[PDB]
Amino acid sequence: MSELEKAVVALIDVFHQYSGREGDKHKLKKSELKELINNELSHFLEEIKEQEVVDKVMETLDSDGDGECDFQEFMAFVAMITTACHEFFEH
Amino acid sequence: MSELEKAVVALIDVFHQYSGREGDKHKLKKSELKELINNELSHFLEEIKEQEVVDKVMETLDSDGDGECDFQEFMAFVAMITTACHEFFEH
Numbered sequence: 001m002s003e004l005e006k007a008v009v010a011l012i013d014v015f016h017q018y019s020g021r022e023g024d025k026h027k028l029k030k031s032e033l034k035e036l037i038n039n040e041l042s043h044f045l046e047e048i049k050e051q052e053v054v055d056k057v058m059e060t061l062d063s064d065g066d067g068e069c070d071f072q073e074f075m076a077f078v079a080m081i082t083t084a085c086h087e088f089f090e091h
Numbered sequence: 092m093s094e095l096e097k098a099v100v101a102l103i104d105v106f107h108q109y110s111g112r113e114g115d116k117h118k119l120k121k122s123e124l125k126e127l128i129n130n131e132l133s134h135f136l137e138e139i140k141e142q143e144v145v146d147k148v149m150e151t152l153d154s155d156g157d158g159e160c161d162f163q164e165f166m167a168f169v170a171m172i173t174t175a176c177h178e179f180f181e182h
């Protein structure tokens with residue numbers, strides 16, 4: 001598999017590594033999202049320590065108002081993070 | 092770096108590995124897009140052999156009508172491919 005194919009698989013893997021811990025196994029609730037950010041984005045994002053901070057990230061990500069981040073919404077999060085990295089974390 | 096952080100970097104790397112070959116260094120023209128699909132998605136997508144086929148993919152991807160795939164448009168392509176992989180290539 002190419003690096004791109006392995007990358008695609010990695011996105012799926014990390015989603016399900018966190019989404020399946022609690023409740024809906026196919027969605028990240030705020031507690032799961034907090035863990036993913038703190039454990040898997042510790043180099044790209046500042047650690048979330050306050051509930052207000054994860055509430056704010058979930059508000060941004062949750063496009064269908066169910067209070068959780070589904071796979072499609074996670075892809076949008078990945079695009080946000082990748083765009084930030086691409087622009088050398090300038091904004 | 093986590094597997095997710097490395098994945099994010101891989102997406103950027105493959106884009107620029109193809110986008111910088113011809114013309115606009117920051118966009119994939121159809122010829123570059125064809126090469127990326129054939130070389131880096133050979134396990135997830137059928138090889139493109141006909142110009143009609145890459146025209147059709149570019150039409151789907153090109154949301155601003157410039158005939159090329161920019162970084163934002165490539166992210167949407169990545170989301171499409173990842174969603175397909177996620178659903179076990181069922182659709």
Ligand SMILES: c1cc(C2=NCCCN2)ccc1OCCCCCOc1ccc(C2=NCCCN2)cc1
Pocket residue numbers: 043044045085086087088089090100103104107
């Ligand atoms: C790879 C390719 C390109 C690229 N290539 C082709 C041309 C275009 N781009 C650009 C960047 C790339 O990244 C390599 C990974 C380096 C680790 C970054 O680590 C951080 C994380 C967070 C910050 C930060 N956090 C918040 C406030 C600002 N700062 C800073 C640094």
Ligand SMILES: c1cc(C2=NCCCN2)ccc1OCCCCCOc1ccc(C2=NCCCN2)cc1
Pocket residue numbers: 009012013016134135136176177178179180181
């Ligand atoms: C990883 C995780 C999940 C997952 N996990 C948590 C639950 C949810 N999902 C799902 C899939 C994953 O993928 C692993 C990579 C296997 C190689 C697939 O290789 C192909 C490529 C193209 C085809 C095809 N092409 C076009 C017509 C149909 N067929 C078939 C097979």
Ligand SMILES: [Ca+2]
Pocket residue numbers: 018019020021022023024025026027028029032
């Ligand atoms: Ca869950």
Ligand SMILES: [Ca+2]
Pocket residue numbers: 061062063064065066067068069070073
């Ligand atoms: Ca949601």
Ligand SMILES: [Ca+2]
Pocket residue numbers: 109110111112113114115116117118119120123
């Ligand atoms: Ca180009």
Ligand SMILES: [Ca+2]
Pocket residue numbers: 152153154155156157158159160161164
């Ligand atoms: Ca375009």
